[PDB]
Amino acid sequence: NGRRGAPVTNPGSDRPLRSLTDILSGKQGRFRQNLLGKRVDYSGRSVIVVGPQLKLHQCGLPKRMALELFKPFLLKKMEEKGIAPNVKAARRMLERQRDIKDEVWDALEEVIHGKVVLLNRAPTLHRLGIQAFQPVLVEGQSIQLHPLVCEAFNADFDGDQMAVHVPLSSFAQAEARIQMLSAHNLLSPASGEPLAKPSRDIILGLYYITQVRKEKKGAGLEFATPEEALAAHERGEVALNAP
Amino acid sequence: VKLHDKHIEIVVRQMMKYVEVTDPGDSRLLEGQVLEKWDVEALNERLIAEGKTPVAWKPLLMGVTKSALSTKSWLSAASFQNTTHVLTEAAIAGKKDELIGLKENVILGRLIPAGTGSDFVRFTQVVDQKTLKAIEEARKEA
Amino acid sequence: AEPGIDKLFGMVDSKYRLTVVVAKRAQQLLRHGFKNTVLEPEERPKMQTLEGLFDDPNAVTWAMKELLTGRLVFGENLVPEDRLQKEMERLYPV
Amino acid sequence: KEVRKVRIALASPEKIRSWSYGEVEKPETINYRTLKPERDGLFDERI
Amino acid sequence: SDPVRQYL
Amino acid sequence: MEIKRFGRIREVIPLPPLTEIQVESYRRALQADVPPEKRENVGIQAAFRETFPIEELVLDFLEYRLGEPPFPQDECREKDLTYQAPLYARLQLIHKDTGLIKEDEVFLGHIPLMTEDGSFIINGADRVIVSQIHRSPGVYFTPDPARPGRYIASIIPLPKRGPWIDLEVEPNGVVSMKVNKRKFPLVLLLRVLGYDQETLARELGAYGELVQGLMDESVFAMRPEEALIRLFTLLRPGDPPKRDKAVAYVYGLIADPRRYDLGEAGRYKAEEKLGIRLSGRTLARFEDGEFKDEVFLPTLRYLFALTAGVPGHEVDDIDHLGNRRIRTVGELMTDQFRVGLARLARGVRERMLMGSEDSLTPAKLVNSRPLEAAIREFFSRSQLSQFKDETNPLSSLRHKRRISALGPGGLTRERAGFDVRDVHRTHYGRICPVETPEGANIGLITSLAAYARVDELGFIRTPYRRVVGGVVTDEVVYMTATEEDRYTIAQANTPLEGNRIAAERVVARRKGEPVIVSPEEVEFMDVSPKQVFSVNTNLIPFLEHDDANRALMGSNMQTQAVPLIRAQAPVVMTGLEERVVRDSLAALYAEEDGEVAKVDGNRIVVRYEDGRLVEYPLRRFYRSNQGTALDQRPRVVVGQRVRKGDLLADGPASENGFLALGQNVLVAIMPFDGYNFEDAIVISEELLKRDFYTSIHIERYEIEARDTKLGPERITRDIPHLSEAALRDLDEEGVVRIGAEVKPGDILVGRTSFKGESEPTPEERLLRSIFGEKARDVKDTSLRVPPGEGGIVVRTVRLRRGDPGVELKPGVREVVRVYVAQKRKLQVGDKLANRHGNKGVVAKILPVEDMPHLPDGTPVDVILNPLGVPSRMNLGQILETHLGLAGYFLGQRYISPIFDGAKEPEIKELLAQAFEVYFGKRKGEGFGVDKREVEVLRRAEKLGLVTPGKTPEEQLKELFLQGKVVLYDGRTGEPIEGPIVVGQMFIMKLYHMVEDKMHARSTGPYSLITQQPLGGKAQFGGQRFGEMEVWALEAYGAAHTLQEMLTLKSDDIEGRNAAYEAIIKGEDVPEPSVPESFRVLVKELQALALDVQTLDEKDNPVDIFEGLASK
Amino acid sequence: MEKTARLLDALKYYGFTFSTTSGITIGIDDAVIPEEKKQYLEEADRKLLQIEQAYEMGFLTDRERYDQILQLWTETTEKVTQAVFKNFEENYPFNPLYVMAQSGARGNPQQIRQLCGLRGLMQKPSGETFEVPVRSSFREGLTVLEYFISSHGARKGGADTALRTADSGYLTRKLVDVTHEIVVREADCGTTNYISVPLFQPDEVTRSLRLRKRADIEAGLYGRVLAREVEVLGVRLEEGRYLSMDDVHLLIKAAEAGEIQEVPVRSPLTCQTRYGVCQKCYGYDLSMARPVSIGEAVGIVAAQSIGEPGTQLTMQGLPRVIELF
DNA sequence: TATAATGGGAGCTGTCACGGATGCA
DNA sequence: TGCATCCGTGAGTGCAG
Ligand SMILES: Nc1ccn([C@H]2C[C@H](O)[C@@H](COP(=O)(O)OP(=O)(O)OP(=O)(O)O)O2)c(=O)n1
Ligand SMILES: [Mg+2]
Ligand code: NA
Ligand SMILES: [Zn+2]
């Protein structure tokens, strides 16, 4: 439709109808919108937040997100201990909030042991808009980003958000930890330079303590003996660091 | 922007991928026809083999856009740009996409031919010595 | 980082071959109940529950440690596939 | 067997017919009362 | 070029 | 507390009524308040006058009237109606042959009405009609981008009221003309106007360059009506050139003031441009048998004299604000009205020549619907009818003053280049240069300057004082861009003795370039600095110390200020905080002098001196468009004596009548152990304690019960398989009780729908066979609450049909709405911002024992991080703290006028005076200097903040005036090695809270054709893993993780189901099969007659449909 | 990696506690307007009418005037920018702006100059510069008119980051499409062809050879693989060897000495691997500073590596890149 | 199912840049 | 034959919508 001549419009609107080629092609077409990348299950989004207490390979996943993104795993575990008899009743527990009992969460913490999730940030410009983290569960809603990896993501905390995706297979785990964990990707693949490096506060800190005072009092006198220079200094006429 | 020359080369190398014929020697090609530098070098061996004349060819420099569109894999090209022009010319020629690249296999959804999916590494086996010798000894005598 | 990774990449010829050896061994374990492990009980990865310390469930952490011992063999074209998926269901049942 | 290539080519009229399970004869969708598909139109179940 | 003016 | 002002600028006039561009506009189009006789031919009227009278029988227009609305403003908000008035129009039919006279007043529909503040109500949601900017009607010349010495001339009417035309003088000497992109020699056209060879040189007669080239007598050898038919062939390749059809086509394009209208503007602009009076808004006339040109030769006169070099012939700058103009709301809708009217006229004449040409009235010759529909359209799907922004009251006011370049009539995003978006010279004091959005709409959507107004022609004009001699008159006049350019105009703050220009160098603009000029040469003077910026921008204190690119964020970010339950006006104000609460029409004032009768959380009644007893009721806890509690609170007490215009209740985000966008807090500016990192923010738990930054929010949860082809849906308390605990808050009918607590999972309204032809299948008919209950025939469709939502049921609305007053969309029995509330404490993730563009997320809430604190025990509230300031370049927030320090200890607030505020000395003065209170209180209360305050002072001396060899008091004094104080870390008692900046800041809670954005799904809805997961928090989405994310995984080489994304996590229906079964069974997930969306790709290529084919390595097909599409 | 991981958290922990206690802040008084200023401000008007007078007496034209009006004001800005850092380093070496810009924690001289010095010349919509600069600082405060003039600049700059962004994206996407099938498919293609990476730049300043800038040489050499032997300064770099970062620095030295002019390297410009590239012709997997592992999608890495910077390329700018690709 | 009736009607407007196929001194 | 000139095609990510 519309390729040749006027386009076929339903009545009372001017919207060209969507013809077979229009489906196939375009940024909105079948290829670019459903074959070269879909939507996905086991994924979440939230506001990020700096956690400077994290180790390089970690992140702050709020526990309400955690539950869902692992909901199958949590149903099976919920049996193997027995916070429910079978998995179907296990699900009906977590479907209203009240019904979540404490040892549900202790149950979860078993679930996610060892395995990582993925963080994704807004424009995935390079291989590093996605990196792997062991989640540590937390209360509150916000994701905790490690400060060193903010650079690759170009993530400040003006209110940016991030995506979470759970890998599933024992293969998709072994891919995330070996190849895509933050702590293993420290040099840029473009320049080969380091990319997890110190930035704003971290170098502000180490500068301030490795800088050296340069005092202007003594102005560089010529004293032939220590014993008197000291004397001069306890006289108050020459500052400690003046050269 | 410190950025390794090799990346830019990788690309440029794909801009240079193609060549124009300038005398078809003893081949089915045609003066002006374009084709991958690879595929002409390819049969210019089958022709130095049957000892006949070789294709005369000529280097071609294409921009990146035109070079993606001219790829072999019509599944890659249709999913990039100029979707019909690609799609028709492919169906006329009854092209078959070999599924050599990434896009191709991403649209089908198969394990891409890179990383954990490279044939170099995907067929690797692992056995504990307490099982590599458990199967090696029943199978030493018929 | 991952504990011991730097030496892992040393063993294999290409980082991705580690990843599949790990993931494969790491599923050999998930299906067999770990009976085939080539660890001893004190090297056993262990997680800490609210009740008490127990075997690490993450079959991948296992597989990695498992690999560092040297007690595993990796490589291409080493067995018939069907002669392993049974001899191992034999030595350690499902 | 396992997919390994993907061929694209013109469908002959007889081939188009090969695929088809019935001539859509009527420009009808679905019955304004039973909200079920009119037979011989675009949603017919015998096709 | 315009399918009415043609029939007209 | 005291309110100390600064500022030397005696502003002459005040801000004008800030919604006049919305209200003045619509009213000057309705006239519903003018006796029809006294109406004037603009707006709703002029449209009638244009389409009428209808022609062969004839039907002529007498007058229209408007009736009051069938329901009051609030009644429509509830009942999802429109706030509209019935439109009657009196007509008289008269017979083209006999003298017939009938006269009915036929009803045309409902015209929607605009409320007091500038908004509309349309199916019960407030909306705004954003004025639109567009190139204005008129005739222009602009050089040809090809031939550097020849210049296109162009002729442009109002949108869709005539065609564009260019007069490019070709490279072949004789001058061309383009209409519907159809070029041809201009000459042929001048002929048709009755033009003669001689009277061209008799009018051109100077430029033998082309004047003599324009003439080519393969044309002159024809009478006027001869070329008339000549050209009908040139634009209609095929139509029979009858001398009835050609006079009709031309006319219907160039002389028919019914589809060719230059603006009322277009007239004047082309008039003064070509310096000719213009009978009507039309290029040509039909008068006394033939065509009498009006505009073509004058235009042709300019163009020629320019392409030689004549004086007074300048190209025009189409981005000047004299050549652009504003289609205000009233004009925008009469456009849509003039298109409904013209459609109704296709519907009369149709029934004027088929059906009975004598037994006819106006009543039955008019189908009101073509009108009713174009109006319903304008307000319900225009680009320019936007959901109102009533986040806080500033948001609604800033909205009404928006200016879009986009929309029907203007620019398609792709059509938008650079010149449209740039700040033009002539924006000065008409359109704000700050207030605009970051992103793709930058420079298209903008804001009205604060003193600026739109004249009757649609141009923006701004005020200026007239200076004579060198004394400055109190007589103000508003100029259009064009006349401004005529004068030398002194700067807002050029200094004066009394009212004489007291300097000898005065800072002035001549056509927007800055010139230094003596007070002899000075004609006008800016009214104020407030006149150059948005309203919002005028809310930024210390603006002149704020780089522009963050002024803009602090500007926009205000309209996102959630209204806080303890809101307070900023300690440092700019002087508008009061008008804004006024014109926002959200606070509530005193109509005349009087005394106060009663007072109450619900109403405020006041006896007046007129004896009248008005009873202002209080809009208490009303849910805004954006969910933000729009709450009116009372500010007087019984018997209070109130002069006129005093206050009687604070609106939301107003404190005693001042715009309270957020709270004033004790802020320390110092890195804090990582929780400052990259604009993150650390806050004192003592904030949630005193309920600072708390806000109330509401969501509507609506449900219908409808008649079905399987039974009726029922709103019952009787839901199958549900435990009483799971209903302990529902009333008899199935409604939660007003005042319950509801959380995720909880039923809000039980409901039952009937099961289908899957009425229990065997598997199920048996499971019940064991349990003694047989299969039940209805279904739980109860409206639960969504994940991560909830609160306290505050109201319910139940509308059935069969009840009075009520009738809902067909087939729906009953519709129940339950409004839920929440008190939102501040929590870790919410966004805070200040008026200077410092924005950040709350990353950490320390308990007060960890907050840095002053010697005298007081803990700070906010620790911002100094790394924000340097690269950001927004220094105002630095000064705003310092003057906040002083205020904090004097107990004062300040009014620092933009660009004319308190300067550094005036303020370091105020800090001294505070120091006295903070320390002199001390060295008398029995304590001296402290041992840590010295160790810090030791350091300050190495830095250079203090003069060495001075009493500690002397030095602490010196640090203070630098706005710096000693700070003890609460984790150690040890002092901060340095002296810190600590002060009082205005900081809003933004609308973007973690609560509204945390979301996650394991598995949920899928899409009909693709079987890929739905998208969006509200659908219970999946996260779109895009081309760019796939690349990412690709570059890592995570084939299995990517494949997963592309099969079991999205649409590999087989392995997807297979997986989730594998997890709950404790098994590893299964290797996947072909995604379903690829199958759709196959079938969709068959439907295009292409035979796609999966093949194995030996080239024989492979059925990815497992035989289900073979026979 | 494992240790650098622990190293990295380490530098994170202490650097973070230190920043807080040390007590860095910002008060208005910390943008120190160097007194050298009005020496330089005054010295300007005199030299301004010293060219408003080689025109006031019609000496040379308006198109000559404006040209030298802003050759003056540009080298005025430079002067007072320096004065702001001399005044810092000699007198307040620990003032927070100085400290922040100096370590690389924030700021650069040019912004900082606007806090303390003067704002500078501003842009006019067209693209031309106002001959009237804004002499105010941000500490000092801008005149309304000053503020306005300064606005054409930023608006024209926002618009830019918005249209630009769409081309980087689009460009990046073409790049991925034309390279996605490139993977490191085999170990050695046995190719015996390579490329000379010139360490010397055929100048026209002296139109001699000037050694090439270090980083640009690092750019063409780091993590390559030699395809012939090299022997420079008693060292033997063998055929086959992956130039480590130090390998590179040694080759610059030997070039500074005259023993070498162009290293022969195995580039992918010449791998004969079909549909991919060998390990050798590639080189290091820069993310690991070691030989690339067979199966890396280096094409996709390339595309990502080249796209990601254009945002972020201010003109020619990114245009010129697109004109070449 | 019968007076007679015999060629339409709205266009829409301010982007851009490249590459390929068609027309013309 | 060389070069106007027209027609068709593109024009960043995700999220709220
Ligand atoms: N249309 C958009 C809007 C935003 N971004 C991303 C890119 C960046 O992550 C951030 C824009 O950078 P900023 O201007 O917000 O500030 P930076 O933190 O990147 O630089 P600085 O630290 O000086 O503020 O938002 C993007 O890619 N495309
Ligand atoms: Mg950000
Ligand atoms: Na930032
Ligand atoms: Zn090679």
Numbering used by the authors:
A (entry chain D): 584 to 826
B (entry chain D): 1361 to 1502
C (entry chain E): 2 to 95
D (entry chain D): 3 to 49
E (entry chain F): 78 to 85
F (entry chain C): 1 to 56, 64 to 1118
G (entry chain D): 924 to 1238, 1254 to 1263
Report text from the authors:
RNA polymerases (RNAPs) synthesize RNA from ribonucleoside triphosphates (NTPs), whereas DNA polymerases (DNAPs) use 2′-deoxyribonucleoside triphosphates (2′dNTPs) to synthesize DNA. In summary, our data show that the universally conserved Arg residue plays a central role in selecting NTPs over 2′dNTPs by the multi-subunit RNAPs.
To further test our hypothesis in crystallo, we solved the X-ray crystal structure of the initially transcribing complexes containing T. thermophilus RNAP, DNA, and 3-nt RNA primer with incoming 2′dCTP bound at the active site at 3.14 Å resolution. The structure displayed a well-resolved electron density of 2′dCTP and β′Arg425 closely approaching the deoxyribose moiety. 2′dCTP was observed in the pre-insertion conformation that was unsuitable for catalysis because the α-phosphate was located 5.7 Å from the 3′OH of the RNA primer. The electron density was consistent with the interaction between the β′Arg425 residue and the 3′OH group of the deoxyribose in the 2′-endo conformation. The TL was completely unfolded in the structure of the initially transcribing complex with 2′dCTP, in contrast to a partially helical conformation typically observed in the structures of RNAP complexes with non-hydrolysable NTP analogs.
